[PDB]
């Protein structure tokens, strides 16, 4: 059985930690909602 618990407000934080790259990828999406890499 599943339940929900509040975790916070949805707000933009000024001066948040900036990380992660911006990859451009060719992908396919199947009927089961699963992504795969196209090559």
């Amino acid at each position: 059985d599943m339940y929900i618990e509040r975790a916070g407000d949805i707000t933009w934080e000024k001066d948040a930690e900036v990380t992660g790259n911006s990859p451009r990828l060719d992908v396919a999406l199947d009927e089961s909602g699963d992504f795969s890499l196209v090559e």
Binding site: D1, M2, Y3, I4, E5, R6, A7, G8, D9, I10, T11, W12, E13, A16, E17, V18, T19, G20, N21, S22, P23, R24, L25, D26, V27, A28, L29, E31, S32, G33, F35, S36, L37
Partner: protein, 156 residues
């Protein structure tokens, strides 16, 4: 139960202890999460019950109590924030410039940030604080790292 707008943890007591299986967004009296988190099952909020209202396995999205409300879109240029809600850990905003998932049906934004599977459903925000999609459905690239789509529903 609690219907206040905000980000929520999706928990279960079926396994050992209390386990976080995912995250979601409460907005305008509707709870929004990824289909793979709940598999469309009903949820509990205190003594209250949330019944599924709309879902789609291909989009990997589900809403409870009403139709999908989130309609903001990534502009294709600006940085965004993942409001990550990791299991056992406090909600944390991480800012990033999304990449792109190019498909035969169009392009969608993608966020290259790595989190435990129980983080699926955490919202992605624009500079106005609007939810432009949920983090938690993606792919594993050549090096082993995770890249999520910016998954957004449609507001009927």
């Amino acid at each position: 139960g609690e219907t206040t707008d905000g980000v929520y943890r999706v928990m279960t007591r079926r396994l050992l202890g209390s386990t976080q299986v995912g995250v979601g967004v409460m907005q305008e009296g509707v709870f929004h999460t990824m289909w793979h988190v709940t598999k469309g099952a009903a949820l509990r909020s205190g003594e209250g019950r949330l019944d599924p209202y709309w879902g789609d396995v291909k989009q990997d999205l589900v809403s409870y109590c009403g139709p999908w409300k989130l309609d903001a879109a990534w502009d294709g240029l600006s940085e965004v924030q993942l409001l990550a809600v990791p299991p056992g850990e406090r909600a944390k905003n991480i800012q990033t410039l999304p990449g792109i998932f190019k498909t035969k049906d169009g392009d969608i934004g993608a966020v290259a940030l790595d989190y435990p599977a129980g983080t699926s459903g955490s919202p992605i925000l624009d500079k106005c604080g609007r939810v432009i999609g949920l983090y938690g459905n993606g792919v594993v690239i050549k090096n082993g790292s995770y890249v999520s789509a910016i998954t957004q529903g449609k507001r009927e």
